[PDB]
Design a protein around this ligand. Structure first.
Ligand code: DHE
Ligand code: DHE
Ligand code: HEC
Ligand code: HEC
Ligand SMILES: [C-]#N
Ligand SMILES: [C-]#N
Lengths: 519, 520
């Protein structure tokens, strides 16, 4: 390629490919596109693949017209070359990507549709680059909205009016749920690779801000809660906590919002730092940089919403932060392999008191940590129990204050008999004597009534009353997927949601439970 | 063609012993640029001679001093003909490897074991000698000359006045116990490749707990134990510019001060234009305030009440004011001059305007005053109240003291030897804030010292403990004659001239008491 051709190629790569293939072409959701593999595949294989895509999730750039004839080829040739240096993504680049479709002045002053917004589910349509807004009681798809390729998660503002979605490429969409036809009212791009977004949830700061975290570049950005305007960009480049050596690319993992202080809770993976970022004053920016444990990923607030509990997954540890005092309080080994809680599950154990649970990706165990230092001090921040569920490959555990059951998936398990089902333990029957709590196996995939592809079940999500729990039956892009609704009280099939438009449904977020952090 | 081992060897030496003055990318600092476009023209032999014998302009004689062997000198001469290596990081492992406690704290004196008058001692920078001279403030005797290391820049004192900390341009930190029978370095460490600043914890209750050093490269600061220098917490300063919000890969740490309101360090981050308030109460659950200020931050000082930090964003001609009590920016004002360079500045009570802080300028002859009293003089607070001329451009330091009525302004870099050898003195008590330029008396400091040969540059006034006498450095070349001139504050007359064979290129002078209490 000439110098200018490589520049277009390089520009297109970082904006439209790095979200799935990575900034250093090492692959993420998409495959490694490094030269090693790339020379042997050769031009032709690469031109064809960029043109036609595949049902595994690679877009048909050529045939969709998304990249015209000649860009497939620039992107065929570029891929043979050596990996470019990943560029920065600052204020100037964010402001150019930032678009306000509907100014705040021109938005409704009251809900202008008859939807039950708090019982609404925002579902990620992975390979379709869209979200589906589904009614929680009548189970109908209210709307399907385009966000962008590699959509990952949905988060709600504290009043429940604004829906924020972010995809793997750092694309952020803001939707106004009060419009007659809810749509994207603002959008912006915050990096080349990202996974996290969150809203200000401190009483009094409702709808004030949104924050987004990037894998690359190493940074988070605080945006205006009503326009998505980028106010403050913070770099997360810094030193590891245990050896204090500089790390040039610390990714931002999960981001939560304090309910005790007007702060955002930011996980910085490779440095092992948890940041408490005060948004009361963005020019005189106060932060608490907490030394924790490397490999931070996901986590959630305890039942009282004071303590942040998060997985340092490759080290098999749970890190606990007190958001009121602003300091690390404990680091404990779960005794399992690679904890992956999502936001985890808080409940009252019959004998141990308030606990938070996590399942694991590397084994079948479920661990319980005591979360009440005031009333159960001898149990606080200790692993009180550990027992098996369906099997390894678990991603999400769920419960709700109105139910006595603990749901645990097994999404990544090799056996389909397992990955298509869910374990359910009766919380009220828990004793803590050594006896493995028994669990009931729900045949989620069987209830979908599907045979084709390779359906996997993932993540339970409750409705607003806590009477029904939803699970995604995740199947390939060209196959039939579904959402199974389980009746919490009877642990019986309630409803099966199937629709042409329900493509690769994964993360599901109930508006009320997400806005209030109820889990 | 140099081997890998040889090359690694040359690189370690370069970053450890040369970058301090030649720059981490070899583009120069006080030393010349050593990038291959210049060196290949000079050639091996020229480079080998220079490294071997050094020069009286400040380049050490590496070979002839035995610091580098003949093999190493040739190793460094070939390395300089090669393309610049990638500047390395300098984390905990590298800091700890350089960390050395010569006298554990349990083995040091429990009380002053010398007869000196510690509080009135002056720690003087002997720039091209790699040393500091400890001089008696009353007898004017050189009590001692201590090796710190090449590129020595400045001295700072722990809050109690017992420990003397010196930092050089290579990031070499020395800690000296002034209580020993015979004071010396009791601990040392290196905190980077290039550095300029250090400061001690000055919050009441934190006396002697911590010391902080800021580096130019890598971009970071380290908080160290105040008694042993153990590196406790390293923080990168890499980040975003405050105004354009673009990543900046090399934000240098300029001046570092200490708050008297909270247990915090006040760190200037130059290229990003950020002032950091760093809480040292708990280094693991580290609290900081990142203040968006103005780019090109450099030096500054606290006002007379020690509540507010006043600092120059020198290339943008601004003074940035930070309230250390509330931890917030309070003001940003243009001084009306070119390149404000206050050092720690000068605080005094102006006759009509109230409490003010002043600074002189490198780019012109103006002296500016900013009101520093929001409570008693609301309308004048954080506003430029007056601007008037002193000797001429090239000014670096302005000074005064609570026990004096005069404002002394040097002019070190002026091209005219008459001006650069002199100091301007203003009568604070005669000022009026009516627009008319105050008059000044010219003190012929170089002339008073009897120094005429070479280029005697007079720099930085520094008062003694009682604020009765002000010292000025008569800076001359290493091979020329230098001196310290002691001026009698009450009469503005020569009190004493300090001369000694060991007094080589004397620059910055720090009175123990005035430095430990931030009296200026
Ligand atoms: C940082 C991060 C968060 C926390 C977001 C927040 O705090 O707002 C998160 C949350 C999530 C959540 C939030 C659960 C909740 O209830 O909070 C879900 C459902 C989810 C479904 C998946 N994630 Fe996620 N996820 C990543 C990162 C993250 N995922 C990856 O780096 C990873 C492991 C690989 C990748 O390349 O993307 C990855 C793969 C997956 C999946 O394969 C999942 C199962 C399906 C999918 O859509 O791709 N991730
Ligand atoms: C960041 C910094 C500080 C604040 C220290 C602190 O807060 O603890 C400082 C302070 C200082 C102070 C502090 C005085 C005070 O009263 O606070 C002095 C006297 C001083 C004498 C000089 N400095 Fe300094 N100085 C630099 C940097 C700095 N000098 C430079 O980047 C520069 C411009 C060139 C260089 O490469 O080092 C430089 C040249 C000089 C000089 O040429 C001076 C005049 C004489 C010399 O020894 O080289 N610098
Ligand atoms: C996420 C939605 C993707 C984006 C955006 C892009 N690609 Fe992709 N790509 C993705 C996946 C999940 C896969 C695997 C396909 C499979 O069927 O297994 C791919 C694959 C490719 C390949 C083929 C490599 C191979 O080893 O077979 C190529 C050459 C490729 N992708 C290129 C490419 C380019 C140039 C993109 C930017 C326009 C791009 N992809 C975007 C997922 C995603
Ligand atoms: C500050 C204390 C220095 C240190 C440490 C080192 N050098 Fe230096 N160097 C310094 C100065 C002020 C000068 C200029 C001398 C002059 O007479 O003007 C130099 C010069 C050199 C040169 C000569 C370059 C030229 O253009 O003439 C060389 C080759 C050189 N220095 C090399 C060098 C090396 C290899 C060092 C590490 C051992 C080193 N210098 C340290 C100041 C300082
Ligand atoms: C997803 N982790
Ligand atoms: C130096 N200033």
């Amino acid at each position: 390629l000439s110098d200018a051709q490589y520049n277009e190629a390089n520009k297109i790569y970082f904006e439209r490919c790095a979200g799935c293939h990575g900034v250093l072409r090492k692959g993420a959701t998409g495959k490694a596109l490094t030269p090693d593999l790339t020379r042997d595949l050769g031009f032709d294989y690469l031109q064809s693949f960029i043109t036609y895509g595949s049902p595994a999730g690679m877009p048909n750039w050529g045939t969709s017209g998304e990249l015209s004839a000649e860009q497939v080829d620039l992107m065929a040739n570029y891929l043979l070359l050596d990996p470019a240096a990943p560029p920065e993504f600052g204020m100037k680049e964010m402001r150019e990507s930032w678009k306000v479709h509907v100014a705040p002045e021109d938005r409704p002053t009251q809900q202008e549709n008859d939807w039950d917004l708090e019982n609404l589910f925002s579902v990620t349509l992975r390979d379709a680059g869209q979200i589906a807004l589904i009614d929680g009681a009548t189970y109908e798809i209210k709307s399907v909205l385009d966000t962008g390729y590699a959509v990952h998660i949905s988060r709600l503002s504290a009043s429940g009016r604004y829906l924020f979605v972010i995809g793997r490429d750092g694309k952020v969409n803001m939707i106004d749920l009060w419009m007659k036809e809810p749509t994207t009212v603002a959008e912006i791009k915050i990096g080349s690779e990202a996974r996290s977004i969150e809203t200000s949830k401190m009483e009094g700061w409702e709808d004030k801000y949104a924050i987004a975290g990037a894998y690359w570049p190493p940074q988070y950005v605080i945006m205006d809660g009503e326009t998505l305007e980028p106010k403050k960009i913070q770099s997360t480049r810094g030193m590891t906590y245990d050896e204090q050596e500089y790390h040039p690319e610390p990714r931002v993992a999960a981001i939560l919002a304090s309910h005790y202080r007007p702060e955002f809770i930011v996980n910085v993976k490779e440095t092992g730092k948890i940041l408490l970022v005060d948004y009361t004053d963005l020019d005189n920016l106060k932060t608490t940089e907490i030394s924790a444990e490397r490999f931070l990923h996901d986590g959630g607030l305890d039942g009282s919403h004071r303590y942040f509990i998060t997985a340092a997954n490759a080290r098999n540890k749970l890190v606990v932060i007190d958001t009121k005092e602003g300091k690390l309080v404990a680091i404990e080994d779960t005794g399992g392999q690679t904890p992956h809680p999502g936001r985890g599950a808080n409940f009252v154990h019959p004998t141990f008191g308030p606990v938070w649970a996590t399942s694991h990706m590397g084994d079948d165990s479920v661990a319980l940590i005591g979360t009440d230092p005031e009333g159960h001090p001898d149990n606080a921040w200790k692993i009180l129990d550990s027992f098996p569920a369906l099997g390894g490959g678990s991603l999400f555990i769920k419960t709700h204050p109105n139910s006595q059951y603990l749901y645990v998936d097994a999404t990544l398990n090799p056996e389909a008999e397992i990955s298509g089902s869910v374990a359910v333990f009766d919380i009220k029957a828990m004793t803590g004597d050594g006896s493995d709590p028994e669990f009931k196996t729900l045949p989620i995939a069987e209830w979908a009534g599907i045979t084709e592809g390779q359906p996997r079940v993932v993540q339970g999500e409750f409705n607003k009353d806590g009477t029904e729990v939803w699970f995604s039956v995740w199947n390939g892009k060209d196959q039939e997927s579904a959402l199974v609704v389980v009746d919490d009280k009877t642990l019986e099939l309630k409803h099966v949601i199937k629709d042409e438009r329900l493509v690769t449904p994964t993360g599901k977020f109930n508006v009320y439970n997400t806005m209030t952090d109820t889990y």
